[PDB]
Amino acid sequence: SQDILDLDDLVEKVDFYLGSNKELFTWFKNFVGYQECEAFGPSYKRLPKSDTFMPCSGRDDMCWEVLNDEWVGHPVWASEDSGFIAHRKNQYEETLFKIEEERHEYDFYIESNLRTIQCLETIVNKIENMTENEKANFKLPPGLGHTSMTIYKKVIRKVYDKERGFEIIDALHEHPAVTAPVVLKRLKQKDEEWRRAQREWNKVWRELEQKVFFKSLDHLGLTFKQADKKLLTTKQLISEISSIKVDQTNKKIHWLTPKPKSQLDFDFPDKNIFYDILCLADTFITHTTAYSNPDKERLKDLLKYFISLFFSISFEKIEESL
């Protein structure tokens, strides 16, 4: 009424206020006279034209046309400077992740070393089949002619010493004739020793995976026992039926004049399950010791009599089925 709120947002607010009252919110919807942009969203803000002008050398006119450089978003802005909630994982899932981490460590190191062995043995079988008069000035480019320029550097810097790895790399670049076979031999020895250790570790990883994996994939079942202790009580079972009745009585005054004469509905399509529960109960009666034998047998015919009397099952069928 102060010429501040727009009609669209007023209609939206009344829709959030009187949505379930369909008759009233229509009176207003029209009593008012509403007939059915710039939606930026919460997670984007617009930079000025000063911050947009940053050199991207590879951009042509189409790239400058189709790429957005003014509207940006960040996880820190969307978090409201609070943070994020990681998904909670079981301890079996955590140790599965640790097994995978160790597996990745071993396989990454072994395969990097194997790729370097393949490149070095290509260099070695190239250098073996030539004489020594030009073997002195034979050099190797960075990357050793391979598509990577850093993988062999990583392998050398790991296998040899930290300070000596750089000078071994430089000696391989300058004089590969002497440095290549010894480096290849040391890498092959490290490869076979790492692979033997990896097999011995693979046994342990496989047995823990067999011990851990199905518990790790179980989410609700890992906490089902305490949940069943907490929620299969008298208070929760009263709460369920009372909540359904409260829902029915709350929605009775709005619509559905034939109010239902029931809250919970139970379906019993199979009758053998009654005999299965009776057998389980009989097994518990036979096993238990805190109940006296007369109390045990009274429990037995009480359960059998209630099942035979509540449902359509006869006592003869119960006796012949159990």
């Binding site: 009424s1 008012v32 006279g33």
Partner: protein, 48 residues
């Protein structure tokens, strides 16, 4: 200056009167401007 941020003490009935007044104003100014544009277009089609 404490008088600049004075909070208006308003009542429910005054809000009701103001809301009704302003919706009736808006509805009939758009209705009357639609009627005036219709009359002007009728005169334009008659003169043409």
């Amino acid at each position: 200056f404490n008088q600049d941020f004075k909070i208006t003490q308003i009542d429910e009935n005054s809000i009701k009167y103001d809301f009704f007044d302003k919706i009736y104003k808006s509805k009939m100014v758009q209705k009357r401007k639609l009627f005036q544009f219709q009359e002007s277009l009728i005169d334009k089609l008659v003169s043409n």
